[PDB]
Amino acid sequence: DEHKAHKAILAYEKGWLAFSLAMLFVFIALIAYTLATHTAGVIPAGKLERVDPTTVRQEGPWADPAQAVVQTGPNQYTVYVLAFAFGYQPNPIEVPQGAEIVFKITSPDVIHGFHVEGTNINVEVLPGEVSTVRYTFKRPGEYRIICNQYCGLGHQNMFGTIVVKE
Amino acid sequence: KPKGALAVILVLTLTILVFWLGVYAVFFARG
Amino acid sequence: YPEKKATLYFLVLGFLALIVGSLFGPFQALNYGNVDAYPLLKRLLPFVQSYYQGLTLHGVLNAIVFTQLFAQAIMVYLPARELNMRPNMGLMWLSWWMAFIGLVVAALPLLANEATVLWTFYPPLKGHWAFYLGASVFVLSTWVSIYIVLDLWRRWKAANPGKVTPLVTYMAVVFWLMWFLASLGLVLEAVLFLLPWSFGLVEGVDPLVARTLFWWFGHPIVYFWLLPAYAIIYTILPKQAGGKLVSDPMARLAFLLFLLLSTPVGFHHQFADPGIDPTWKMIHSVLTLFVAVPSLMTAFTVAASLEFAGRLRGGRGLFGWIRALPWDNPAFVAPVLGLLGFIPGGAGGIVNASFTLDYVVHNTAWVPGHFHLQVASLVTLTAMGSLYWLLPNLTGKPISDAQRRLGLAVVWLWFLGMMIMAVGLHWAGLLNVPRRAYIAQVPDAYPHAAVPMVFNVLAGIVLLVALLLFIYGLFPLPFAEVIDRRLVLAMDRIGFWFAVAAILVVLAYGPTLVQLFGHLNPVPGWRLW
Ligand code: HAS
Ligand code: HEM
Ligand SMILES: CCCCCCCC/C=C/CCCCCCCC(=O)OC[C@H](O)CO
Ligand SMILES: CCCCCCCC/C=C\CCCCCCCC(=O)OC[C@H](O)CO
Ligand SMILES: CCCCCCCC/C=C\CCCCCCCC(=O)OC[C@H](O)CO
Ligand SMILES: CCCCCCCC/C=C\CCCCCCCC(=O)OC[C@H](O)CO
Ligand SMILES: CCCCCCCC/C=C\CCCCCCCC(=O)OC[C@H](O)CO
Ligand SMILES: CCCCCCCC/C=C\CCCCCCCC(=O)OC[C@H](O)CO
Ligand SMILES: CCCCCCCC/C=C\CCCCCCCC(=O)OC[C@H](O)CO
Ligand SMILES: CCCCCCCC/C=C\CCCCCCCC(=O)OC[C@H](O)CO
Ligand code: CUA
Ligand SMILES: [O-][O-]
Ligand SMILES: [Cu+2]
Secondary structure, eight states, rough: OOHHHHHHHHHHHHHHHHHHHHHHHHHHHHHHTTTTSGGGGGOOOOOOOOOOOTTTTTTSTOGGGGGGGGEEETTTTEEEEEEEEEESSSEEEETTTSEEEEEHHHHHHOOEEEEETSSOOOOOOOOOEEEEEEEEEOOOEEEEEEEEEEOOOTTGGOEEEEEEOO | OOOHHHHHHHHHHHHHHHHHHHHHHHHHTTO | OHHHHHHHHHHHHHHHHHHHTTHHHHHOOOOOOOOOHHHHHHSSSTTHHHHHHHHHHHHHHIIIIIIIHHHHHHHHHHHHHHOOOOOOOOHHHHHHHHHHHHHHHHHHHHHSSSOOOOTOOOTBBBHHHHHHHHHHHHHHHHHHHHHHHHHHHHHHHHHSOOOOOHHHHHHHHHHHHHHHHHHHHHHHHHHIIHHHHHHTTSOOOOHHHHHHHHHHHTTTTHHHHHHHHHHHHHTTHHHHHHHHBOHHHHHHHHHHHHHHSSSSSSGOTTTTTSSSSHHHHHHHHHHHHHHHHHHHHHHHHHHHHHHHHHHHOOSSSSSSSHHSSSOHHHHHHHHHHHHHHHHHHHHHHHHHHHHTTTHTTTBBTTTHHHHHHHIIIHHHHHHHHHHHHHHHHHSSSSOHHHHHHHHHHHHHHHHHHHHHHHHHHHHHHHHOBSSSSGGSSSSSSOOOGGHHHHHHHHHHHHHHHHHHHHHHHOOOOOOOBOOOOHHHHHHTTTTHHHHHHHHHHHHHHHHHHHHHHTTOOOOOOOOOO
């Protein structure tokens, strides 16, 4: 009775532990895969790149929004997004479809989310740091930007826009 | 054999896999 | 027994905290149902200035205060009762009082709209010193619990050389040691930055360092919440179901593994942070998938125990055992119900942990959906159900049949409402709805969310009734028996495993923290509420 049940459960538990361990490992392999594709561009470059939030709106690449979209290669654009209470500059961000877009996002106040609806772009913006992420737009049109990190009372209404030209 | 325990851990594996392959699919769709 | 009085004080304060924080629950849920009830809330509770002050209170009171108090009750009293020994009473009251004093002190600025930062309090969002000082003194209370339990262990170990540590005590020792390690992350954040900054000593704080230190402490905190439910599930629930614990070794191994793996995983909250090397994020990714192992193990060990109870009580078939279990006992129902919702909850967890997959869901309604299954349901439910054995044992007072039935009602409504709410938020987050957001205030922003929104409203009402009922209600320990000595002996070499646990932290945070401390960039604070 009880000796038999204990032997059988453990026997089956050992098997489940082997199965679930393999399941986890397969997931690990499947993540390793994502890491080698273009789709991994949305992981922030791991690089520290300090900036001063008190002057970032008065000198340097973020202080002229209309000149924030720069061509940096034959099929590559860098965009110096500013994320602030409570909006983004530029509004809108205009970029061509099929070009690689390197987003360099910083804040001058408090942390902000930068989440491009319909895409894997989903990065924190820290005052003092530049968050760098890459993405290629595959469909032309209007994407919206949502702030997904609580930034104060204007949070729920903090939106921006990206336009990807056909 | 602990048939009951097995049913539970089968449901668990189904839930994990559905969620996991679910969102993995979503990741590529938005990729 | 003076340990009962101390324990009761801890539980009571924790449940008060639960009721008060939970009051904002329904309102938030309606909010995620695109219905705005904050004019009604502001009339009732006129000190509340905003959704976000509401959100702060909810989070801090429910997820820091109640859960901690519940751990200090369970994971001191239970070992004390297993050993049949007294805790150091002076220390036990000291712990209570720090909890109580730190709480009062944080509550002030909180109630006065002076610290509307969330439970996460990320700089540069700058709160009142009393919040940080109060929160600090609050958490440090646990350091006293840690000691107390280590004390009991040693005193017993003296009386009993060459005996393995009994199970519950084993659980609590690995638990409290784990927590000492995890807690350092916050101690480090408060002392080196939060306190200096909030008192006016330094002019800035580096947001990246503060989050890194925060999340050293911020993950194992959830395990610190869970493990008290676990201890009960393992060593009590089986008697409650009419069965027995099926493996004492396996339970120890679960807990051991949490001690090893609870802390070195924090970057899984920082997949979207700049300036963390991606290789590190992968490392913490695998380590996180590792930490799911003890739960996978717990899923099996526990189910087996329930089946066992179910067959003992004469249920036959593949599902027969399920209907043979005591669905009339709220102390059994609550944890089992929470176990069920823990299935999709952990499923979401495993999703969040996989590095790239987190980009889909990070900072959406998905996350709150995931964790209401975890803490708001399994933990809270387990807590609610212990009332039905824990109260009598502590108070002398018996539970009526009426109170029993009202308890079955509360737990069921709380579970169902939680499940409904979990469908709403998971789905809403798949539709890109942000978390932590007074969305009902931008009614036309998320039209595609119309359906999951109905779920969210329904849940708000179901959970309001359950809360209301729980309030209306609120006004020997059934340790189970157990059915490979050497493994057991290996797991009893505690200082060793403790040492290892520490190395794993140094190894997982050392290189990244050194890097960051070498390049600090403090930035001015802000109050945007
Ligand atoms: C108590 C509270 C919590 C637990 C436990 C919990 C578990 C997990 N979490 Fe989590 N979660 C994450 C990963 C996981 C992983 C891998 C697990 C795992 O431990 C899960 C293991 C569980 C299982 C593998 C399921 C086992 C099932 C069992 C044991 C039940 C079986 C049934 C039985 C036996 C009954 C059957 C009986 C019958 C009668 C039929 C990550 C990232 O990787 C994020 C960040 C995402 C982001 O972008 O912010 C996160 C964020 C959160 C936050 C939000 C923090 C914030 O405010 O920003 C909270 C509070 C939270 C709480 C909790 N979390 N989590
Ligand atoms: C009366 C039932 C309750 C309801 C209906 C409920 C409702 C909610 C909802 C709708 C949110 C999301 C709000 C937002 O993200 O803007 C939320 C957040 C949260 N709740 Fe609850 N919940 C309840 C009880 C609890 C319990 C008992 C806990 C913990 C034990 C708790 C922990 C959390 C945490 C920590 C937050 C996140 C706050 C933040 O982002 O800073 N919930 N809840
Ligand atoms: C134990 C009890 C658990 C809870 C079970 C009760 C469920 C709520 C009632 C539903 C009936 C239909 C109600 C729908 C009719 C009113 C809806 C309406 O008019 O909408 C309100 C407005 O849009 C917003 O401000
Ligand atoms: C697409 C991938 C497939 C997904 C579909 C889900 C598969 C079911 C999951 C786990 C089975 C767990 C049971 C494993 C235990 C094996 C049995 C065992 O241990 O057998 C020894 C026993 O003593 C007799 O000889
Ligand atoms: C119980 C849970 C039930 C859950 C129900 C599952 C719903 C999943 C929905 C969407 C995921 C896919 C997102 C794919 C994003 C593509 C968006 C797109 O192509 O359009 C936007 C663009 O801006 C136009 O110009
Ligand atoms: C007890 C109830 C608790 C609540 C449980 C929460 C429910 C969420 C479950 C699964 C999400 C699976 C991910 C969705 C997968 C559908 C999308 C898909 O198939 O992906 C390709 C498509 O083109 C993309 O738009
Ligand atoms: C007994 C043997 C059991 C072994 C079990 C192994 C499980 C499957 C593993 C890997 C498949 C990896 C392929 C990943 C497919 C996704 C690619 C994709 O979704 O699309 C392309 C994207 O746009 C980028 O170019
Ligand atoms: C969308 C969210 C809503 C979905 C909600 C569904 C979730 C599962 C609900 C209940 C599971 C309960 C499992 C077993 C039921 C126990 C009752 C039973 O078996 O009764 C015994 C009998 O009365 C002699 O004691
Ligand atoms: C014992 C308790 C058991 C717990 C287990 C219960 C959890 C259910 C899991 C997943 C449901 C998701 C449903 C599958 C998703 C369908 C996807 C779909 O229809 O796609 C939408 C489309 O992409 C855009 O409109
Ligand atoms: C109990 C049985 C199960 C089901 C029966 C009760 C469930 C209905 C509850 C509330 C709906 C009433 C309010 C619904 C309105 C909010 C959600 C909605 O439709 O919002 C989108 C729209 O754009 C907004 O302007
Ligand atoms: Cu910016 Cu929320
Ligand atoms: O914390 O997961
Ligand atoms: Cu975590």
